[PDB]
């Protein structure tokens with residue numbers, strides 16, 4: 001399926017600037033997502049908290065908002081609770097703590113940029129991306 005440049009263009013930070021991933025960067029981000037993120041976020045969902053999925057509306061409500069690439073990169077370095085108060089660096093996988101997340105130890109900052117871009121392109125691609133799982 002061909003993905004155009006507009007689809008691969010997503011917010012870079014909060015003030016209106018955007019970034020466009022290459023096809024290669026998209027591919028790499030998708031691959032990392034499948035290998036490392038789908039154990040807890042299949043289809044962009046979250047099941048152990050409400051409204052803290054990878055869907056855009058949920059990301060937008062985080063503190064600071066996570067619906068832009070740089071905020072996602074920051075989260076994957078130094079994860080926090082949704083209100084930003086609590087340090088999740090020993091709770092959520094991240095590249096700061098390869099000692100406890102060895103599956104993260106070979107990803108560079110640029111790899112994390114690619115999965116962050118992937119995460120924000122994915123909802124454009126799939127109406128079912130994101131959401132809270134309820135039982």
Ligand code: HEC
Pocket residue numbers: 033036037038039040041046048049051052053054055058059060062066072075080081082092093115119
């Ligand atoms: C289970 C072992 C997880 C793995 C692997 C990954 N994530 Fe995760 N993530 C998980 C939980 C339980 C939560 C909720 C935290 C909370 O505040 O209760 C999250 C949350 C995120 C978020 C924030 C979503 C928001 O709407 O603010 C992001 C951006 C996120 N996780 C990303 C992410 C990525 C890209 C991962 C692969 C590198 C990844 N997570 C793995 C649990 C788990």
Ligand SMILES: [Ca+2]
Pocket residue numbers: 034035036
């Ligand atoms: Ca894996």
Ligand SMILES: [Ca+2]
Pocket residue numbers: 049050
């Ligand atoms: Ca809650």
Ligand SMILES: [Ca+2]
Pocket residue numbers: 035036103
């Ligand atoms: Ca792996």
